[PDB]
Design a protein around this ligand. Structure first.
Ligand SMILES: Nc1ncnc2c1ncn2[C@@H]1O[C@H](COP(=O)(O)OP(=O)(O)OP(=O)(O)OP(=O)(O)OP(=O)(O)OC[C@H]2O[C@@H](n3cnc4c(N)ncnc43)[C@H](O)[C@@H]2O)[C@@H](O)[C@H]1O
Ligand SMILES: [Mg+2]
Ligand SMILES: [Zn+2]
Ligand SMILES: [Zn+2]
Ligand SMILES: [Zn+2]
Ligand SMILES: [Zn+2]
Ligand SMILES: [Zn+2]
Ligand SMILES: [Zn+2]
Ligand SMILES: [Zn+2]
Length: 338
């Protein structure tokens, strides 16, 4: 059976037989500025995505026959990796003078490409020099990023994500006893680590006002308890840093860890669309929307599914119903790691 050009028509599990190729493509897709080779970041992303779906490792150029999304530029990168196990193109990005600084600066919560670039052009190369500088001005997000750096740079693991889930559920149930709280993002796709923990909160009985007030109630409750380290409030959402007591963690192993937490509140009837959107991966979501537009003349996003031919919104109480409306075989969350 031929491999679809769409990630939403492939099953992509975390059992990647092509990590040598994918890690190089991901470096090239992530570093457009630092790159010296002709090719598009979209072409690198789609090629990395198809390779992730393969049930076998590429061991020769003949293995690439019949695989879509492998352009001439991508095939030269695959060729170079087969040749000695490394990509000269990815290696040039890794050896680029700005690369190390950009990775380092953007690893701070509140620091994006614009700020990383500003600091690099000022002559900064280390966080220690940035933090101790007397002339620099930091946003409140960056101050939290620097204060809790070590904890935030350690990625969150599953026992920690689950301990956060318990905290979220206890806070949410206090104000909305009928609320459904679902962990989304990478953890829902079977990942063992993450840079943060995402949740989708919905309530079958909440009014428009109760649902607007919930995130404010929960964050105030955490502030009173001394757990809120940072807070910033399409759907209503908040980006937080929570104080997690390691005594709440059920694992094999300061007494606390700073954890980045994202909370999304959605109306009950749109829960399936928000769940689908927040589960990801980013490439899976991109392909689902591209397939819906180009193959079905449908408009899909985190809030709804609209049929442009019938001029009607399509309702769904589950992700399964969305796939069915799209004429797609159902792809389980752990199979969406495109
Ligand atoms: O790569 P790697 O560097 O290994 O990890 P990471 O992407 O930084 O860690 P996560 O995968 O846990 O966090 P995320 O916010 O990047 O989204 P996630 O994949 O979990 O979740 C995937 C989906 O959730 C969404 N999402 C999660 N967090 C955010 C964010 N704060 N802003 C916008 N969308 C978000 C996206 O819409 C995406 O489709
Ligand atoms: Mg996440
Ligand atoms: Zn730039
Ligand atoms: Zn690009
Ligand atoms: Zn831990
Ligand atoms: Zn997130
Ligand atoms: Zn235990
Ligand atoms: Zn398009
Ligand atoms: Zn919308």
């Amino acid at each position: 059976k031929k491999i679809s050009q769409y990630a939403c028509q492939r099953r992509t599990t975390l059992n990647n037989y092509n990590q040598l190729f994918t890690d190089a493509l991901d470096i090239l897709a992530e570093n457009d500025e630092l790159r010296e080779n002709e090719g598009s970041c979209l072409a690198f992303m789609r090629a990395s995505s198809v390779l992730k779906s393969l049930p076998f490792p590429i061991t020769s150029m003949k293995d690439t026959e019949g695989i879509p999304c492998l352009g001439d530029k991508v095939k030269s990168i695959i060729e170079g990796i087969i040749e000695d196990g490394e990509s000269s193109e990815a290696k040039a990005v890794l050896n680029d003078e700005r690369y190390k600084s950009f990775k380092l600066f953007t690893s701070v919560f509140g620091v994006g490409l614009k700020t990383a670039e500003k600091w690099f052009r000022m002559g900064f190369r280390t966080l220690s020099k940035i933090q101790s500088d007397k002339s620099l001005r930091f946003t409140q997000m960056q101050k939290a990023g620097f204060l809790y750096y070590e904890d935030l740079v350690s990625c969150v693991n599953r026992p920690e994500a689950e301990a956060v889930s318990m905290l979220v559920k206890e806070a949410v149930v206090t104000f909305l006893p009928d609320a459904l709280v679902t962990m989304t993002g990478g953890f829902r796709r079977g990942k063992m680590t993450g840079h943060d923990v995402d949740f989708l909160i919905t309530s079958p009985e909440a009014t428009e006002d109760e649902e607007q007030q919930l995130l404010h109630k929960v964050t105030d409750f955490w502030k009173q308890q001394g757990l809120l380290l940072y807070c910033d409030i399409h759907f209503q959402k908040c980006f937080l840093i929570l104080k997690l007591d390691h005594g709440r963690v059920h694992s094999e192993k300061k007494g606390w860890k700073a954890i980045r937490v994202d909370l999304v509140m959605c109306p009950y009837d749109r829960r399936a669309f928000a769940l689908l959107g927040w589960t990801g991966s980013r490439q899976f979501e991109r392909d689902l929307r591209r397939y819906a537009t180009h193959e079905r003349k449908m408009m899909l996003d985190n809030h709804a599914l609209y049929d442009r031919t019938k001029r009607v919104f399509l309702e769904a109480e589950s992700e399964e119903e969305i796939f069915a409306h799209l004429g797609l075989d159902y792809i389980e969350p752990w199979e969406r790691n495109a």
